[PDB]
């Protein structure tokens, strides 16, 4: 009772986290996991993408204010979905690095367990390819902190027949967060007396905004539309099959 | 041959991985996208971008008792999306093996010949993916690789570039070079419809318009997902039904 | 902290004056200081330099009256001074250099001048090895700290690869006398289209300065000769008088 | 190949060229006259360049300029040597420096190579070092005696050579911008124009504008010194 025996991560939540991790190969991304904790099983059905201003190598820290906003969001999910929802865990990415938790990760996870005991830690290792084989590898590690060491937690990615409305909205928040980060930087240099600097700053801002649109926003638009179109392709295919199979 | 690079976005790749981890057992489907050519300083580069994927039960395309593609069944399923098909993928569970089998190569040639006759047969793609797990299932591993059939009759791996904020394929300077012009885009159609094609403010307005459109597609995605999911349920129940009736007759 | 910035153009001119000099050379540093919020860091940008004979500023006591008559109205933009020693390779500060830095920092310090704490002393040398095929040029910027001790300041040569404005890629606004360039910007009465008009107007103005520079150089060189030759004449005459 | 005499104004152009960039080696050619073992360097050509640490058309423009100097200055002006910079790198000629120099000596004997090592600041001391190495190749790098000859002014050609750097950088940007002018993708079009915009303002802020200020203030500071000499000359004449 009350011990983390197994973690059941919904496929749609898995897609969001992976999409978040694949957004950049230079820095580590982070976010929080939401769901319900039953008889030793942490069922994850929601996810919050977080903003990380820090660009330090191993320093992946979720603020106190972010935890409060997430819990508040988890409170709203309960009223909406009519189901127990709560911050169950946290995730972050490992670009060009092994999926194994660092010393700081284990220590950070340990502090979380003083608060929730059954708190879950997920790590997504991305951007690791072979120079000759051209093969890519992506790892997903579910862990906790024991006696100062990292320990595996049994993970099963539970099938979903669709991508949740909340999961769809969550990955639409990514570009919005990124754009907001850029708006804050151009804010500190808003009214420059130097004309050359003003032209420079606008050119820098323009390139940065387009970059987010070209890499993040545009592909998500295409992915959503293609999904809609390709489902109709499959739907009509299944409809024609349903008639021929209904006989014998 | 020529220098080949396969590119893909995080969204499209995540959707592929998402679609794979859902499936009960193994899974295959087609790769949709576009090929582009670039001149460089004195050779030509080939950029094949995967825009989307679609799954398909292999048995829906086979004659019966043979692993031979029914070209009619294949045409009826793909419909008018044949011009977008740039390859196919194969996903396998509970294995770290990432080597092409005889059946995969056979399907590759058939899929190439069919679709190449209507891209070129040199760079029809085969995406081989797998998913394995550790002893305690605490660590999940996902491997994948892109391949093509060389003119010399060899299956060789192709470099894959996942376009992200850190690095993308357009950076060979900071300028984005214009590809070799060719005849015959959901995102640009949105821009053209909003007269945003005709640039700091433009960059912001296009982003905002994309966000608004993105927020409008969400309920349509859910509607289409549920529609197919129910159809996938009915058809599968009929398949198991006739498979047991045919089993009893044997 | 405190940062000294300079362009390759201005720095090359300082080196030009140093090398073409007959013996050791002395002069002043012209520029402007700006403050940036980030803590409060200060960038002192040296824009130009001017050479001046030390023997024409003395009554080791500096003549402040004769000093004013030299710099004239350009006293408001003096941010420091420089000393060039041809021989030797040491870059240490001697007693005279400290005494000269003190008087200069005191004279130019005021409401319209520059802050006395941020007055600069530039040491420059130019040694040469045996056979004289390898020439060595070393330089450093110094300031008088609160403790009473002089300390080396970081120098940043603003170039294409990197500059002091990149501390991000955005140009941060500083905390609030138009030059010849700003007046050119305003003359055009103005994204990409603006940029192209600047480089075009700047190039034409740049080529128009070339004949103006040559006539100023020839004038000051002719006068520098006449003064030098005349002082030599009076020296020989008074040595026999 | 006995000694090399470099004019200060030419020395300024070469150093100014080396102080233009920090992440790349900059290059150019030397032009002057060769007498009794000594090379009187009097001119300089700023060349445009290969991102790696390594042409015909460039030698053509240089030889053409050297011929034009012979008809305007009435002196045997020809390509005497070459110069290149070493940013964050010792002034000592590398294995390719001796190699390229060796092939040049075959075409023209007594061919001189100059190296400007720049951008080397000592940590916790804030001292900068700039070396000027005059070298040739025989078998290894050999040191040739160098003297920087005083100039009463900056040459009309040297001032124009300084202005050529700003023109070259801009031209190099136009050639890249023209290579992808009409892009069917609107996002790429906005991108490329933003890249071009930032680049032009970059060249102006770093090279063009300071060069204008350097020239403008030099005229202002010359006349300041000139007036000072006039007051002295007036008193000396009376004495
Ligand atoms: Zn980590
Ligand atoms: Zn070299």
Residue numbers in the entry:
A (entry chain A): 3 to 250
B (entry chain B): 3 to 43, 53 to 129, 132 to 185, 188 to 199, 203 to 216, 221 to 272
C (entry chain D): 5 to 42, 54 to 74, 78 to 185, 188 to 196, 201 to 214, 221 to 271
D (entry chain C): 6 to 54, 56 to 60, 65 to 149, 151 to 250
What does the paper say about this structure?
BRCC36 is the catalytic subunit responsible for the majority of K63-Ub specific DUB activity in the cytoplasm and in the nucleus as part of two distinct macromolecular assemblies characterized by the presence of either of the MPN− pseudo DUB proteins KIAA0157 or Abraxas. BRCC36 consists of a functional metalloprotease JAMM/MPN+ domain followed by a predicted coiled coil region implicated in protein-protein interactions.
CfBRCC36 and CfKIAA0157ΔC protomers heterodimerized through a large buried surface area (SA) of 8112 Å2. Non-canonical helices α4 and α5 of CfBRCC36 interacted with helices α4 and α5 of CfKIAA0157 in the form of a coiled coil helical bundle (CCHB). Consistent with our observation of robust catalytic function in vitro, the active site residues in BRCC36 when complexed to KIAA0157 resided in an active-like conformation shared by AMSH-LP, CSN5 and RPN11. Productive features included the coordination of a high occupancy Zn2+ ion by the triad of His94, His96 and Asp107 side chains, the position of the transition state stabilizing Ser104 side chain, and water-coordinating catalytic Glu30 side chain. The active-like orientation of these key residues was supported by productive conformations of underlying secondary structure elements including strand β4 (denoted as the H-strand for positioning His94 and His96), helix α3 (denoted as the D-helix for positioning Asp107), the β4-α3 loop (denoted as the S-loop for positioning Ser104), and the α1- β2 loop (denoted E-loop for positioning Glu30). Consistent with this prediction, the projected active site region of CfKIAA0157 showed no evidence of a bound Zn2+ ion. We attribute this to the substitution of the two essential Zn2+ coordinating residues (His94 and His96 in CfBRCC36) with Cys101 and Arg103 in CfKIAA0157.
